[PDB]
Write a protein that binds this ligand. Structure first.
Ligand SMILES: CC(C)CCC[C@@H](C)[C@H]1CC[C@H]2[C@@H]3CC=C4C[C@@H](O)CC[C@]4(C)[C@H]3CC[C@]12C
Ligand SMILES: NCCc1c[nH]cn1
Lengths: 57, 235, 280, 342, 128
């Protein structure tokens, strides 16, 4: 009765995942783009800092 | 920056103490030869080499031949899936593959396992010291005649003993056909690919066999010697 | 004679260019590639640097002296030039000797190789090469040990000819022949074993793979240096006029040509270096 | 009867979830970020090379001060580096040399490691005796330890090859919560910035979002075609990126509960070992089996640059908390520190 | 999501012929080596046959050699197993197993207890 016990658990898990609230992909995509824009200046890898401010000269 | 200078000297001094210890570990690491022991449950891989320490789930055997240290690692406490943890042993000297020769039902299973290890991208430069264990049981099975290899291996019907074969004295001709067909079954895999980067060293061994440590020592010498000869364009 | 002199000048110029360019590539390959900076290549780099110094400090002055047939420069510089010639040639030959010994240990004792060729011994081996090279070249010439104005030939006497000949060339030659013949037998034995692994598969290793490689390594060393040291020993015993001037110039540049063959035999014929050139 | 009916209900639920995700897939991240300008060419130089490991490096983790880092190698050595000076601060000899993961505690007082020994060992870096000692050995996993991350000085989350993740109480040595549901070896995990959630990627080609306090799987993310080897949260915690053996990197969104972008190239046919984000999240750095690290534009799926400085597999990489540098570990036994210049 | 659906099979008299079909989805079918694995009642899973990515390389177990034929259709994303001259020893649940990684010659864990890239299986019965 291992398979029948596993089947109940797998079905029960899919019910929890199917009842979540989902936002639109456009809303989620915009939020990722907004966060990148706001923190762009403070990203040393994206915008390398002057050699005076680089600890790894 | 007097305080900063004091810290820099202390950190520099601490580094030098570590490096001296690392130098000692380097000599110990390079002197030892590491081996991966692989085999199914039917194979008696645990009794292949006659210092055994159980470190967590990994069983380690340390044996010495002619003042050369060998550390054989046997992975015990893992799931049957192994494509991930097998990558930990991409730099071993050799892989010890142990096969139960008497078990015809699981013989193809060992061949499939040997095929995956031989053709894995991270084990393409690792030689395999193949041990065809339980040769005594194979002789009894062949002489009894109850089970036929041709039932599991139809090619064996048209197979003949190689001329280079060296049967043991007082050994039945039917036994040496079975012994070398199984060995050739593994050699078909090992000679298909490899491009001279790795070779398979097959040996016939029994449960009461005290020469297996020397065979590993001899094969490891051949493996490294062939690597050195190939590097100098001598092979 | 004018046509011949132009032809000889080109050959000497090409020989210098090959020696300098061939050894710069070996030095550049090791410097650029991190994987090539290992203890195994220390003797190859040391050999390449020594041959590179010969191609810059000794070969240009040997070509000028050979073509002009006179030493325009001062006598004081002649002793320095001849000392550099002896030092760099002796160190180059002894570097080849250490390469053969290093390969002998790797092939013949593969299990204990990582612990027998520790970098301390590699540094010791290189130091002893130059200590002997300096002793035979600068100490001997400046103290008159090798002593018997337009000529700038390296002098030799009966005692110096035998000591320099045996230590620099003949003793290493005897050991290298024994070392490379034992490696030859092992390579041939391994080739036969690999070819006979299975009956259904054809031979994957050429039978003369080791024969060609070892005859090239030992043949170049013998051809380039045996006539020079045989003449060098004979000249010391029977005087400087015993050897013909033309013959002495031929055997001199044969030894110099060995520096142009070392980057090919020990780097171009190494699997690690050939793949290193691709990343360069 | 009952078993046959239940497995049919799972298919109906899977179709229900797939339709729900398709309903909210109004646009594509590629379409949204088409207008924004590209990041250009990202050029990074090797500022530091960390030498001293004598075997393949399998894991690294930066400390929160962005200066100290810990690396693990299968020579049985845990090394703590001062990245500014390349000085070795500590060298911890491991009882089992088959280490696969290492973690630096956010406080900086502890490091953790573990591998094929199925144990997560905690090492105390701040002792009155002046040496690093084992403080805890967390036993309970029946497979190899693939990843571990501290939540604080007393809690750590581990992923194992026994298909489960666990949350441990270090002081008591017991796993308070067990996270089950993966059908393959869990290879990596990443903690959310608030440490209330964590994502894990397994060899069943799926990524699961777990609630730390509640202890159940909230969401399951599929879309990869092979084992997931690496996973990393987006800096705001609303997304994560994965790397698989199918030579692709995918960006999943938590709230949209679906994949947003794929980072793959036709030349790339090798597996991915490690993934990380830059401080702003605009750059996705991925390590590959072909010895290279590719810098991707997270928003536009463009290969911004390449870190080519290793002669063997790139096994791990990580970006400092301040975003100043990225470290890459490799099977060639070296670590390299990278950053750009103005 | 990677999913494999085994179809075909059922009750066939000994000596009969049977064709199995495996429907592949969620992955680039042309990039993976495919396998057929069966599990006899009271026995563990065993490998039957495999076919390479392009179909050039094909292997079989010696117990089914000369009676089983494996073929694949990359365009159709489907895998086939033709089983003629069946035997009562061939009664087993047949599984369509995909090799874990693309562009590889090895195939490690297809015959494992819990393998993610293996289908639910189809039942083949030969006993009269
Ligand atoms: C790689 C090997 C084959 C290179 C061999 C180079 C030899 C053949 C060439 C290079 C230098 C040349 C010598 C240069 C100068 C002279 C002096 C002249 O009065 C007689 C010819 C003679 C002696 C040449 C003989 C041939 C020579 C020795
Ligand atoms: N031109 C060769 C230099 C030398 C070395 N030993 C004697 N002479």
């Amino acid at each position: 009765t291992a398979s029948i016990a596993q089947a109940r658990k797998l079905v029960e898990q899919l019910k929890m995942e199917a009842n979540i609230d989902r936002i639109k992909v456009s809303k989620a995509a915009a939020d990722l783009m907004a966060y990148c824009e706001a923190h762009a200046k403070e990203d040393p890898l994206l915008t390398p800092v002057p050699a005076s401010e680089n600890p790894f000269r | 920056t007097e305080d900063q200078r004091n810290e820099e000297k202390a950190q520099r001094e601490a580094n030098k103490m570590i490096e001296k210890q690392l130098q000692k570990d380097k000599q110990v690491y390079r002197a030892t030869h590491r081996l991966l022991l692989l085999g199914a449950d039917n194979s008696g891989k645990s009794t292949i080499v006659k210092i055994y320490h159980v470190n967590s789930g990994i069983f380690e055997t340390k044996f010495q031949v002619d003042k050369v240290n060998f550390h054989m690692f046997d992975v015990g406490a893992q799931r049957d899936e192994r494509r991930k943890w097998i990558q930990c042993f991409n730099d071993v000297t050799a892989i010890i593959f142990v096969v139960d020769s008497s078990d015809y039902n699981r013989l193809q299973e060992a061949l499939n396992d040997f095929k995956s290890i031989w053709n894995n991208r991270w084990l393409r430069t690792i030689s395999v010291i193949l041990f065809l264990n339980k040769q005594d049981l194979l002789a009894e099975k062949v002489l009894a005649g109850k089970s036929k290899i041709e039932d599991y291996f139809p090619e064996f019907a048209r197979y003949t003993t190689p001329e280079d074969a060296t049967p043991e004295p007082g050994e039945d001709p039917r036994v040496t056909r079975a012994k070398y067909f199984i060995r050739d079954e593994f050699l078909r895999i090992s000679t298909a690919s490899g491009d001279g980067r790795h070779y398979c060293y097959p040996h016939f061994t029994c449960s009461v066999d005290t020469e297996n440590a020397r065979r590993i020592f001899n094969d490891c010498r051949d493996i490294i010697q062939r690597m050195h000869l190939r590097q100098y364009e001598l092979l | 004679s004018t046509a011949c002199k132009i032809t000889i000048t080109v050959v000497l110029a090409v020989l210098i260019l090959i020696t300098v360019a061939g050894n710069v590539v070996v030095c550049l390959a090791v410097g650029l590639n991190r994987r090539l900076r290992n203890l195994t290549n220390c003797f190859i780099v040391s050999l390449a640097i020594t041959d590179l110094l010969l191609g810059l400090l000794v070969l240009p002055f040997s070509a000028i002296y050979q073509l002009s047939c006179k030493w325009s420069f001062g006598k004081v510089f002649c002793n320095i030039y001849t000392s550099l010639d002896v030092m760099l040639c002796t160190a180059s030959i002894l570097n080849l000797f250490m390469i053969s010994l290093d390969r002998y240990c790797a092939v013949m004792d593969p299990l204990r190789y990582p612990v027998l060729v520790t970098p301390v011994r590699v540094a010791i081996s290189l130091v002893l090469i130059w200590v002997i090279s300096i002793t035979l070249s600068f100490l001997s010439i400046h103290l008159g040990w090798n002593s018997r104005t337009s000529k700038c030939k390296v002098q030799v006497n009966e005692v110096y000819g035998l000591v320099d000949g045996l230590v620099t060339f003949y003793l290493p030659l005897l050991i290298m022949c024994i070392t490379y013949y034992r490696i030859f037998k092992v390579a041939r034995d391994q080739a036969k074993r690999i070819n006979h692994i299975s009956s259904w598969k054809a031979a994957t290793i050429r039978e003369h793979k080791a024969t060609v490689t070892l005859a090239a390594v030992m043949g170049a060393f013998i051809i380039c240096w045996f006539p020079y040291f045989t003449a060098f020993v004979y000249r010391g015993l029977r005087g400087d006029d015993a050897i013909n001037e033309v013959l002495e110039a031929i055997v001199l540049w044969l030894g110099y040509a060995n520096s142009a063959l070392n980057p090919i035999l020990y780097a171009a014929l190494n699997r690690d270096f050939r793949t290193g050139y691709q990343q360069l | 009867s009952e078993l046959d009916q239940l497995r049919q209900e799972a298919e109906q639920l899977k179709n229900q979830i797939r339709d729900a995700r398709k309903a909210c897939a109004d646009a594509t991240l590629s379409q949204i970020t088409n207008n924004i300008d590209p990041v250009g060419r990202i050029q990074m130089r090797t500022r530091r090379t960390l030498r001293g490991h004598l075997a393949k490096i399998y894991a690294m983790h930066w400390g929160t001060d962005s200066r100290l880092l810990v690396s693990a190698s299968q020579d049985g050595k845990l090394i703590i580096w001062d990245s500014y000076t390349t000085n070795k601060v500590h060298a911890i000899p491991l009882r089992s040399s088959w280490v696969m993961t290492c973690a630096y505690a956010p406080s900086g007082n502890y490091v953790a490691c573990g591998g094929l020994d199925n144990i997560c060992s905690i090492y105390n870096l701040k002792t009155r005796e002046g040496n690093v000692r084992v403080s805890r050995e967390l036993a309970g996993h029946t497979g190899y330890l693939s990843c571990c991350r501290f939540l604080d000085d007393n809690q750590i989350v581990t992923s194992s090859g026994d298909t489960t993740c666990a949350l441990w109480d270090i002081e008591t040595g017991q796993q308070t919560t067990t996270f089950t549901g993966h059908t393959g070896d869990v290879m990596s995990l990443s903690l959310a910035p608030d440490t209330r959630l964590f994502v894990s990627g397994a060899c069943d080609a799926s990524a699961k979002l777990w609630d730390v306090r509640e202890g159940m799987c909230r969401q399951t993310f599929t879309g990869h075609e092979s084992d997931i080897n690496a996973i990393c949260f987006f800096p705001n915690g609303n997304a994560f990126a994965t790397g698989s053996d199918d030579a692709t990197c995918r960006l999943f969104d938590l709230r949209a509960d679906q994949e947003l972008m794929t980072y793959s190239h036709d030349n790339i046919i090798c597996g991915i070992t490690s993934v990380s984000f830059s401080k702003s999240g605009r750059l996705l750095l991925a390590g590959y089996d072909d010895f290279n690290c590719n810098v991707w534009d997270a928003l536009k799926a463009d290969r911004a640059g390449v870190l080519a400085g290793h002669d063997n597999r790139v096994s791990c990489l990580g970006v400092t908390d301040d975003g100043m540098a990225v470290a890459t570990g490799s099977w060639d036994s070296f670590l390299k520190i990278w950053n750009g210049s103005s | 999501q990677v999913q494999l659906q085994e179809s075909g099979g059922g009750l066939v008299q000994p000596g009969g012929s049977l064709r199995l079909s495996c429907a592949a989805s969620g992955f680039t079918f042309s990039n993976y080596k495919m396998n057929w694995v069966r599990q006899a009642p009271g026995k563990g899973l065993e490998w039957v046959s495999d076919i390479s990515q392009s179909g050039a390389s094909i292997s079989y177990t010696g117990s089914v050699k000369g009676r089983f034929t494996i073929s694949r259709d990359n365009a159709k994303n489907t895998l086939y197993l033709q089983m003629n001259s069946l035997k009562p020893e061939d009664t087993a649940v047949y599984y369509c197993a995909r090799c874990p990684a693309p562009f590889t010659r090895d195939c490690f864990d297809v015959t494992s207890t819990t393998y993610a890239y293996r289908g639910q299986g189809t039942q083949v019965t030969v006993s009269s």
